[PDB]
Structure 1
Amino acid sequence: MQYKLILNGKTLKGETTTEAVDAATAEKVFKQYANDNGVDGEWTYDDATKTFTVTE
């Protein structure tokens, strides 16, 4: 399955998706990716909607 991370930061907004087998392994990219793009906020995740979101 695929997970989609929505970028809701101060000035940085967009979309990010990845193809992973596990949900937690996918967060590794999204969580670490946040430092790479410059968005660090409160994370969340619903496996029933395959969607992550970081709000700062």
Structure 2
Amino acid sequence: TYKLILNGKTLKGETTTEAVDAATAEKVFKQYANDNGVDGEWTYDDATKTFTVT
């Protein structure tokens, strides 16, 4: 389970996913972000398996 923190101006929240590798998760998250109109900067922290977009 990897988590995505979405930090936007009109939309804020968090979500999670179960994926075999970080690369696979990123693709899932990117698709989601694109679909919900959230575009920004992505960061990944391996100790907490968290991706953040701003």
TM-score normalized by the length of structure 2: 0.90
Q: Residues 14-49 of structure 1: CA distance to partner in whole angstroms, max 9, x if unpaired?
A: 111000110110000111111101110010101111
How many residues align? The count is: 53
Conserved 8 A contact 1:23-1:47: no
Q: Distance in 1 between matches of 2:25 and 2:19?
A: 6
Conserved 8 A contact 1:5-1:51: yes
Q: Distance in 1 between matches of 2:51 and 2:15?
A: 9
TM-score normalized by the length of structure 1: 0.87
Percent of aligned positions with the same letter in both sequences? 100
List, as ranges, runs of 4+ consecutive aligned residues in structure 1 with deviation greater than 6 Å. Answer: none
In structure 2, the gaps of 5 or more residues are none
What value does the CA root-mean-square deviation take over the aligned residues? 0.8
